[PDB]
Amino acid sequence: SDTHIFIIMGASGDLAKKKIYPTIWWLFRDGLLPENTFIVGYARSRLTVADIRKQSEPFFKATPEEKLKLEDFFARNSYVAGQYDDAASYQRLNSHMNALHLGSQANRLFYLALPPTVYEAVTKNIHESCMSQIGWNRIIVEKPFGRDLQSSDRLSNHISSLFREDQIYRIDHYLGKEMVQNLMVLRFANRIFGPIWNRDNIACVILTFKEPFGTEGRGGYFDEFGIIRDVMQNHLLQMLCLVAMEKPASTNSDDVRDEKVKVLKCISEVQANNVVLGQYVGNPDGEGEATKGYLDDPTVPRGSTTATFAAVVLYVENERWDGVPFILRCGKALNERKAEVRLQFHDKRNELVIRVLPDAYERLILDVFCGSQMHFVRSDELREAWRIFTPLLHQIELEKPKPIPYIYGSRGPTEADELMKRVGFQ
Amino acid sequence: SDTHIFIIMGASGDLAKKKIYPTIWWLFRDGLLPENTFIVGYARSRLTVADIRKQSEPFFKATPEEKLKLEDFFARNSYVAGQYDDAASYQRLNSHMNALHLGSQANRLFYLALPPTVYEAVTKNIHESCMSQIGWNRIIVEKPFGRDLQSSDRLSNHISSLFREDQIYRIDHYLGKEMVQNLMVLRFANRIFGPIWNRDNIACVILTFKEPFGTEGRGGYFDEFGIIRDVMQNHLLQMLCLVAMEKPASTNSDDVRDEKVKVLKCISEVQANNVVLGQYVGNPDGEGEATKGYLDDPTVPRGSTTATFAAVVLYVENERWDGVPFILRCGKALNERKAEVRLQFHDKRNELVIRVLPDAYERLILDVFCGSQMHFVRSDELREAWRIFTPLLHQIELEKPKPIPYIYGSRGPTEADELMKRVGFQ
Ligand SMILES: NC(=O)c1ccc[n+]([C@@H]2O[C@H](COP(=O)([O-])OP(=O)(O)OC[C@H]3O[C@@H](n4cnc5c(N)ncnc54)[C@H](OP(=O)(O)O)[C@@H]3O)[C@@H](O)[C@H]2O)c1
Ligand SMILES: NC(=O)c1ccc[n+]([C@@H]2O[C@H](COP(=O)([O-])OP(=O)(O)OC[C@H]3O[C@@H](n4cnc5c(N)ncnc54)[C@H](OP(=O)(O)O)[C@@H]3O)[C@@H](O)[C@H]2O)c1
């Protein structure tokens, strides 16, 4: 229809006031939201809309001449309070949404801006209380999608036992304002260079994600993940899929995601001999945040063996690719801010390099509004990535191997380049 | 065999003392010449080897410790004097070559460092006087290979009436020390991206040759050619061939040159509507040779309509390429020193970019020594390029259209970009 309700499960946290309210503001200001779109937040802290405004207007970049549009925006805003496992609270939320103009028939988009530890509760109550009877119901879940195959499997099974896959939207948007253009141009490259990309012409493919900045006083949150769960298992693996995939049956989201799943189902579990881990130490001669290392961050626990750099070799095992090594190299606190995919050819060796107005996160919100699931990891697709990376992560958490120390600013630990050479790179 | 004689027809000119003596020195110093190689020069001016040495040693970059190798080098040197159409002079040359150690059986490589106006004479006398009876005989001819289809045809017919094609080596080496790597990597790219390069995936191909420097006090020699005869008709057309060619039957020089000829035989004669010509004027705000324009060069005749920039659209007409425009854009005195080939794809539009120890000219001398004709335009291949570009050049010399004036440092006359847009570039 034409009436939409944007439920924000958790308006009192960072992601709410720092981004999603600003981003929805930015889409409304530019006339990109549906004309009949209400924004309804919901958390336990009792507070007025004006409190959200006083504590989240700084981040809007508002200018005096455009503020009347903002007044209409906040007329669209409303907020109610309640618990996350209180049936009466969800009933109050549902009745308040029904009270809005045409809220009975309206589409409902639930953004779970909550720590996944409460998801099991929320997804339940919504399912039995707040789902629309006429319009569609789409839920946006947030990272982490578990931390291993078992936890991710239990969470995804719980969520998919209540919502069809065309209602589950797993969003990921923390690696740059050009995050969607990456996958878009990589899909275009797979559609163009489809016939060339075989084991006959290519000897090795690499996928690189370098960042020049460290954790920057926030290594405490990064310490509970690791560089494998933060960059590799989700994004680099998705672009590996996009590189190695077959020609899709069409341009539907589900067909290309089927091809990505088919690619993932051919990658065996990575083992430690094909893995090089590294941790960045403070640069003695640099200045600024360059002087501090990973362990010099106060939020990082002492003795942390968490890797902030990883080089991993995977192999797609079919007829198109066999023995062709896919080298995923990523790392915080490096020499450049580079995100590229280089395919080296069977012959100095020659290689093809693929380097990178709706801006990423906004593009993603608009995809869930229109309904295109193109860029969201699908539930069965995730299980395969977690299967690939789970034994290695269990081994790392069990044995806790000391990551190779590398100097802040270096390209990486020399063992990574040695690993590349062992498999056949030069 | 093992004995070689390097005849240099014309040791008293620039190309002799500035390059070919230095280059052969550089190949001997590095042990790249055959061990039994004699260097024998020949021109009308009577002079000793020591005069060539006193006037060409500056250009050798000799260092005190390496000069004993140079003494052996000049022991290999010798020189005789005579006319270019005097039978007795060529008889003296032949007897002197026979006098050398094993000179009767030795291979003979004739380098015609002479203005082509005497070629007809030289190539005759050699054919009847100085060709070896046991070893091979290879002649290196030099630009210009004529100036239109008729003159080039008469010259090539005269030369090929005396020497087989595996004896004629048309050398071209004035556009950079990386001139051979260009064609090498372009051949590799054709062998790799063969299946992709069709009219289905590609909408437009461009081939760019930009130079940031002007004529630099030597516009008098450039004025008799034009930018079409200096860059486009020879080099850019060769790399167009290398891009659009089919898969060769093997890796022989003659098979790939057959493919290049097959490509050339499908390009019709270019007409003025697909041509944009430009002449560089002095930059008022720049400094140095930037202040002077093309007409400010004293060696340039007043009122010269010679084009120093050209943008030309050609079309290969077969089944692999049809309606696919090949845009050859070249120009002296520009913004960058760039030599690239960009293939634009059928969709912002995406494009594939191909940009560029034996160093070019040395690599070429070594190819004629070993005998690989890979990088030398073959006699039947040249005729096709001259056929393509002859009507346009006749029209330019007849009507003398004033080239579009463009500012020194600009990308080029706006009419070139307009021409690109007319054919379908964006
Ligand atoms: N790179 C990443 O992976 C990344 C980065 C940023 C955010 N995120 C995800 O984004 C989501 C939003 O989190 P946030 O960082 O923006 O802020 P947040 O403080 O984690 O959560 C926002 C709201 O959640 C409720 N909440 C927090 N902890 C709770 C608990 N233990 N029990 C019940 N309710 C609780 C509170 O609402 P009330 O107290 O008002 O009820 C709080 O204001 C999280 O799921 C987080 O994982 C991920
Ligand atoms: N970009 C280009 O196209 C380019 C650039 C450089 C050179 N070249 C070619 O390289 C070749 C070498 O020429 P160069 O520039 O190095 O010097 P050059 O002075 O043209 O020729 C060298 C020798 O040729 C003889 N010679 C010159 N004009 C003659 C004439 N009208 N009749 C008879 N003999 C004559 C003289 O020998 P003696 O007086 O001792 O007998 C002279 O020392 C030429 O064919 C030229 O076209 C081309």
Domain coordinates in residue numbering, chain B: 3-142, 179-423
Q: Contact A196/B193, CB-based, under 8 Å?
A: yes
| Adjacency order of strands within the sheet including B168-170 | B77-81, B36-43, B3-9, B107-112, B137-141, B168-170
Decide if B78 contacts B85 (C-beta within 8 A).
no
Mutation site for A-interface testing, chosen from B182, B186, B190, B193 by largest number of A Cβ within 10 Å = B193
Query: Of all residues in chain B, what percent are helix, strand and coil, respectively (each to 5)?
Result: 40, 20, 40
Which residues lie below 8 Å from residue B382, measured CB to CB, with a gap of 6+?
B145, B152, B156, B170
Q: Which amino acid is at B296?
A: D
Helices (H), A77-215: 87-99, 119-129, 149-160, 179-192
Task: Kindly provide the residue ranges of all beta strands, DSSP E only, lying in A167-270, ordered along the sequence.
Answer: 168-170, 202-210
Cα separation, A52 vs A390, in Å, equals: 40
Q: Identify the residue whose tokens are 């000049």.
A: B74
Best CA proximity match to A18, nearest among A145, A139, A144, A174: A174
Q: Supply angle C-alpha A201, A202, A204, rounded to 5.
A: 165
Q: Is A371 annotated as a binding residue?
A: no
Retrieve residue B281's tokens.
Answer: 């004027």
Residues of B in contact with A201 (CB under 8 A): 192
SS3 label, residue B27: helix
A320 with A198: CB under 8 angstroms? yes
Q: Which resolution in angstroms does this entry have? A: 4.0
- Contact list in B for residue A195 (CB cut-off 8 A) is 195-196
- Contact at CB, B350 and A201, closer than 8 angstroms: no
Residues 6+ away with beta carbon under 8 Å from A31: none
- Residue B111's alpha-carbon distances to B9, B94, B151, in angstroms, are 6, 15, 21
Of B192, B195, B196, nearest to A345 by CB-CB distance is B192
Would the CB of B143 count as within 6 Å of ligand 2? yes
Nearest Cα residue in chain B from A348? B185
Substitution target from A190, A247, A343, A350 for chain B, most B beta carbons within 10 A: A350
Give the residues across from A138 on adjacent strands: A109
Distance CA A320, CA A198 (A): 5
Chain A contacts of B189, Cβ < 8 Å? 350
Q: A114-120 long-range CB contacts below 8 Å, 24 or more apart? A: A114/A9, A114/A10, A114/A13, A114/A84, A114/A142, A116/A141, A116/A142, A116/A144, A116/A145, A116/A146, A116/A155, A118/A84, A118/A85, A119/A155, A119/A158, A119/A159, A120/A155, A120/A158
Query: Which method was used?
Result: X-ray
Instruction: Name which of B185, B188, B195 is nearest A195 (Cβ-Cβ).
Output: B195
If we measure between CA atoms, which residue out of A340, A378, A404 comes closest to residue A141?
A378
- Return the best residue to mutate from A15, A90, A112, A225 for the ligand 1 pocket (most ligand atoms within 8 A of CB): A15
Residue B116: CB within 6 Å of ligand 2?
yes
Best mutation site among A114, A152, A175 for ligand 1, i.e. most ligand atoms within 8 A of its Cβ?
Answer: A114
B350 neighbourhood in chain A, CB within 8 Å: 185, 188-189, 192
CB-based contacts of A95, cutoff 8 Å, min separation 6 = none
Instruction: For residue A141, give the ligand nearest its CA.
Output: 1
Min Cα–Cα distance to chain B from A245, Å: 17
CB-based contacts of A111: which residues, under 8 Å, 6+ apart? A6, A7, A8, A9, A20, A140
The reply to whether A176 sits in an annotated binding site is yes
For A141, the enclosing helix (H) or strand (E) is: strand A137-141
Task: Mark residue A22 as left, alpha or beta (left: phi above 0; alpha: psi -120 to 50; beta: remaining).
Answer: alpha
CATH topology for A179-423 is Dihydrodipicolinate Reductase; domain 2 (3.30.360)
**Is residue B53 within 6 Å of ligand 2 at its C-beta?**
no
Q: How many residues does chain B have?
A: 426
Which residue on chain A is closest to B198 by alpha carbon?
Answer: A192
Nearest to B234 by CA among B172, B317, B153: B172
Tell me: is residue B387 an annotated ligand-binding position: no
Put simply, the answer to whether B185 touches A345 (Cβ < 8 Å) is no
Q: Which of B185, B196, B345 sits opposite A196 (nearest CB)?
A: B196
Q: What share of chain A is helix, strand, coil (3-state, %, to 5)?
A: 40, 20, 40
| Residues A157/A380, Cβ–Cβ less than 8 Å | no
For strands B275-281 and A107-112, give the pairing: unpaired
Please tell me the distance from the alpha carbon of residue B138 to that of residue B162, in angstroms, as a whole number: 12
Structural element, H or E, at residue B313: strand B309-315
Q: Which amino acid residue places its CA nearest to atom 48 of ligand 2? A: B143
Helix (H, G, I), strand (E, B) or coil at A251: coil
Tokens of A40: 């309804």
Question: What is the b/e burial string over A289-323, where b = at least 16 CB atoms within 10 angstroms of the residue's CB?
Answer: bbebbbbebeebeeebebbbbbbbbbbbeeebbee
How far CA A252 is from CA of A255, A259, A374, B52, B347, in Å, comes to: 5, 11, 8, 75, 18
Q: Is A114 annotated in some ligand binding site? A: no
Task: Note the Cα B405 to chain centre separation in Å.
Answer: 27
Residue A67: CA count within 13 A, CB half-sphere: 7
Q: Is the CB of B293 under 6 A from ligand 2?
A: no
Instruction: Please enumerate, as own/partner, the contacts of B257-260 that have beta carbons within 8 Å and a separation of 24 or more.
Output: B257/B373, B257/B378, B257/B381, B260/B381
CB contact at 8 A, B225 and B144: yes
Among the residues of B146-236, which ranges form H helices? 149-160, 179-192, 219-223, 227
CATH number for the segment(s) A3-142: 3.40.50.720
Alpha helix ranges (H) inside B77-118 = 87-99
> What value, to the nearest 5°, has the Cα angle with vertex A156 and ends A150 and A162?
140
Q: Are B175 and B235 in contact (CB under 8 A)?
A: yes
Element (DSSP H or E) covering residue A174: none
Residue A14 annotated as lining a ligand binding site: yes
- What residues flank ligand 1, with Cβ below 6 Å? A 10, 12-15, 43-45, 84, 113-118, 142-144, 174
In B310-378, which ranges are continuous DSSP H helix? 361-370
Taking the C-alpha atoms of residue A283 and residue A293, their distance in angstroms, rounded to an integer, is 7
Nearest to B354 by CA among A130, A119, A350: A350
A351-355 and A339-345 as β-strands: parallel, antiparallel, unpaired? antiparallel
Rounded Cα–Cα distance for residues A194 and A198 (Å): 8
Q: With contact defined as beta carbons under 8 Å apart, do A196 and B189 qualify?
A: no
The tokens of A354 are what?
A: 């693929």
* A256-264 long-range Cβ contacts below 8 angstroms, 24+ apart: A256/A187, A256/A374, A257/A373, A257/A378, A257/A381, A260/A381, A261/A378, A261/A380, A261/A381, A261/A384, A263/A316, A264/A237, A264/A381, A264/A384, A264/A385, A264/A388
